């Protein structure tokens, strides 16, 4: 606070939600239906949230197209995770999918329709009938090509009914902590420069991903991992940050997404030999193989000279063989995004695409109830009182080492809803709103003032560029110990260059320079923890692929028959979640590891799924 | 080197009794992306961090970057840069909106007006939420095509001269289309009460059929057609059809 | 009386007034188009006519001068036929265009022809016929007055 | 420092809470209908007035124009006569001026038809110049 005067404003709520995407708004609806005085803090108008950019669909075994079973969905969810996923949470996800997506419909979400009058479903990457033995599944419910747009707008519309009180364009600075409990949030009001402290019994972190750590991504400029940064500063270790989803088809030059649903409607990848190369890298599922396997397939084809376009550095996604009536009905949005950005009539020419950073299966560790946790190796999982997290910023972990397509919107709605269900049942009306500790959020304002008036010689836009550029080069699709370790070196030096930060805009009223710097600080905390976790991990599971450790290191060798082998001890194998404790001041990162939960929520309802070899 | 120049409206509300202004900025087209947002971002990062504007998605789906460019209301992230360097491109905020700073308008009447239509599905028989899907035929749901696409960006409202003078009473094309999006939804029962809210002379009838809304909409939608349709309904010249009956085997 | 949102909207405006905030440029900056220029013309022509009817009817009453001795005054200014017939065009057009465009706007009011191609054809179509009709109505009679100046019989 | 003061929630339009007491039926729909029918009805009347002349077309024109113009200026006044730019009472004054405008118009046309050449004739005399 040293230099300037800041107008602080106190607010009291039953629950504050940092976020207004799927997760954020679904949780507000639940809590406001359940009577609670809810506050939604979001740094941008909720409709601008990234959920709105989602395209392909949302998974649920509705069986509109053919018979289906949520257990078959559960299988694919677990196999998708390469057995890094907590199966209790993946149970909850899929068990509830039909209900959640049906609700979405009942809320007015205009799902595309089958002739029978039911919800249209398409095929998507990494899903199958019958516990991986039957054909290709069709669980992916959609509003054509804009499922995320339509879902978020429907959710938002319905959130104008729960008497939920929105704080729009408020930049969340930190969690308000009092002796290991979360009593609120502190944020900045862009409109007028005022600082806002929210007292609250509960606090739900629903902030989305950190795609802007990299140089090229499908994500928004607002995907800066603020929530995870918030958690790091609260003294909470983050989980599985090294697991970065590269989506196979992002438009070559510009990074805009072309949905996996374009493959699942019949489209396919083609290399410069005019060959449908996915028939080699995955004979069974071809173009619909899991996300990490396809992105690796493309990446090799580039590296072995089979790449397409002038520089032979991307590949083609061919759709023109499909009928123009299907393309306009199933894929109107990308049909247009391709025209604007690539200059491509998708009905005749193919789209130049290339793997692009997309999703973050890592995030804030929680139990299956979406309650944030710390982990000691003796005391195990210990919940953080008052704190929940959900959506992409969370790590339940329902995605483990590779997220299944159309499982995210689902994740956000399910666990967003789950928060309200859980708070309803654990929060009771005798308990009163916590009084803040003294000088609460004072360091948050200190940082604000410092960055606002930052006088250094490295300006905020250069630093972010070299962070993004670094992360792209070292912590890429294919990683190696020496490159990683050299990258960790560079990044830890960029963290130091943060003290030499220059800003220019000294205003408080809507200062996009100030916030973009705050965002950079946050981005550094995510990026640094991402790469040190990626360096230490000596194996190749899901989206994490080490060239110098190509095998997935489990407790057993699941390629050979299991019995007649001895269990490797926790410390030797790698089926375990990565935890990254970071001091936000020094930047130093300690590492720890947390067992993967293998039980389901109820063996009577469904049996767990023992690791096998992951082959699509 | 190819140097395009932009004339950008500026306003700083913190300066003592400040006035709006026009600021010229030169941009090398060969060190900048193809779209106008790219130019704004470059200028912000390489010249002037005080330059303030909304953005989020890079692909024209968020609606954050709505502003006035080359005279028309459009999205900066998908409007290409006019590469005729002898021309300057003028960039103003959404017309006739109160300006917080630079290209950032106050958007809360727009949003308030969006709330007032109750943009959520209503049914006269209370339904069990998780339990089953409502029936709607392909035909019936296709009536939403051209209506749900709306990203709620405000371009059309801020192009409407009726909404310029009477924003306080005329709901404007953006909200009016969305209102109609809940009226012709066959799963919605409250068609009657929705129309009831905009019965008066200003709410909808102050649409003077100017047609800027449909011309300028960057998502190629047509709100004039939807406002016209609401008028037909308000004058009893048309009714909403009855929901196609839900089959027995559903 | 007001709907609740209209009451909220007033309070919103008064708030914005209070915050000493500027209004983003509108007429001064918006690209002239066939959409809003034609509306502007439909109004201008509509209003101009009423104003002429008011300044006419109320004018020639309140003044000693009447319309016959007015026509004599301007006749006696001996001004060329090309200029007179222009003033007649200027008088016919407001009526022609407004009446034509009037029916176009009723179409819009019924959701008819609201797509941009139709909007633009309609705009041109109506400006056309109005000029054709205005010219027809000025020229044809003046052509008859030449068929009388120099004529057999 | 954080030695703050307690704050209120932002301005936010509760669409349900604004639904309790809002019955009133003031349907401007039927009026908007006849306004356009009347316009359509005037469509034939204009070329009719080109061909047929005299003191009764002068009278039909006088009436229908007066009525159609009354409805017109009313809207133009309601567009521009805004209380935000004029204050509440000057706005009311202008609204009243729309009625004064209609009433002088008719009186002015009645006078002109009754103590002068009349509308159609007056057009003839400029089209003879
Ligand atoms: C291009 C694209 C397409 C996709 N398509 C699909 C699909 O078809 N199907 C699918 O299942 N998944 C899809 N995904 C993944 C999925 O859409 C997202 O992961 C999901 O929507 C995230 O929801 P969320 O609520 O967790 O975060 P978001 O939807 O990103 O919302 C984040 C919220 O957090 C708020 N916030 C952030 N920082 C702060 C701060 N400091 N203070 C206050 N508020 C803050 C923001 O304002 C925002 O409201 C897609 C992702 C992308 C990038
Ligand atoms: C500022 C401008 C001010 C304008 C004045 C405002 C007055 C408006 C009221 C006009 C009412 C109609 C006039 C008819 C008329 O004057 O007769 C013809 C006359 C000639 O006498 P004259 O020379 O005596 O005429 C010949 C005598 N028979 O005057 C004309 O020539 C006017 C031409 C009218 C054009 C008709 C419009 C086209 C309509 C199309 C409709 C389409 C489908 C149905
Ligand atoms: C003969 C056929 C005519 C038709 C079909 C017609 C139609 C219309 C219509 C539809 C409007 C409403 C426009 C809106 O609200 O945006 C209107 C307005 C108006 N008309 Fe006419 N009209 C006709 C003749 C006339 C005449 C002869 C006058 C003579 C003074 C006139 C003066 C006006 C005025 C002043 C308005 C004011 C509203 C506005 O500018 O938008 N009209 N007319
Ligand atoms: O004001 C209108 N158009 C913009 C405009 C304003 C002033 C002038 Cl001088 C010219 C124009 Cl086009 C307008 C025109 C026809 C119908 C309705 C309007 C109004 F009132 F709604 F905006
Ligand atoms: S209609 Fe087109 S313009 Fe009007 S809001 Fe929806 S999108 Fe933006
Ligand atoms: S710009 Fe305005 S008046 Fe009506 S049709 Fe279009 S809304
Ligand atoms: S920034 Fe998303 S609409 Fe342009």
Residue numbers in the entry:
A (entry chain A): 30 to 645
B (entry chain B): 33 to 282
C (entry chain C): 34 to 186
D (entry chain D): 28 to 156
Report text from the authors:
The enzymes of the fumarate respiration are anchored in the inner mitochondrial membrane where complex I (NADH-rhodoquinone reductase) acts as a proton pump that is driven by the oxidation of NADH to NAD+ and coupled to the reduction of rhodoquinone (RQ) to rhodoquinol (RQH2), while complex II, serving as a RQH2-fumarate reductase (QFR), transfers electrons from RQH2 to fumarate. Since fumarate respiration is the major pathway of energy metabolism during adaptation to a hypoxic environment for many species of parasites including adult A. suum and bacteria inhabiting anaerobic environments as well as some human cancer cells exposed to low nutrition and low oxygen conditions, the pathway is one of the most promising targets of chemotherapy for both parasitic diseases and cancer.
Since it is highly restricted in its freedom of conformation due to the planar peptide linker, an investigation into the effect of a linker with higher rotational freedom on its potency was considered. Two very promising hits, NN23 and NN28, were found. On the other hand, NN28 inhibits less effectively A. suum QFR (IC50 = 0.028 μM) and surprisingly it is virtually no longer effective against porcine SQR (IC10 > 90.0 μM). NN28 is bound to A. suum QFR in a similar manner to NN23; all interactions including electrostatic interaction between the trifluoromethylbenzene ring and the guanidino group of Arg 76C, hydrogen bonds to a fluorine atom of the trifluoromethyl substituent and the carbonyl group of the linker donated by Arg 76C, Trp 197B and Tyr 107D are observed. The covalent bond connecting the dichlorobenzene group and linker was rotated in order to avoid the dichlorobenzene group and Ile 43C collision, the result was a further collision of the chlorine atom with Trp 35C, Ile 30C and Trp 173B, one after another. Therefore, the model structure suggests that NN28 is unable to bind the porcine SQR.
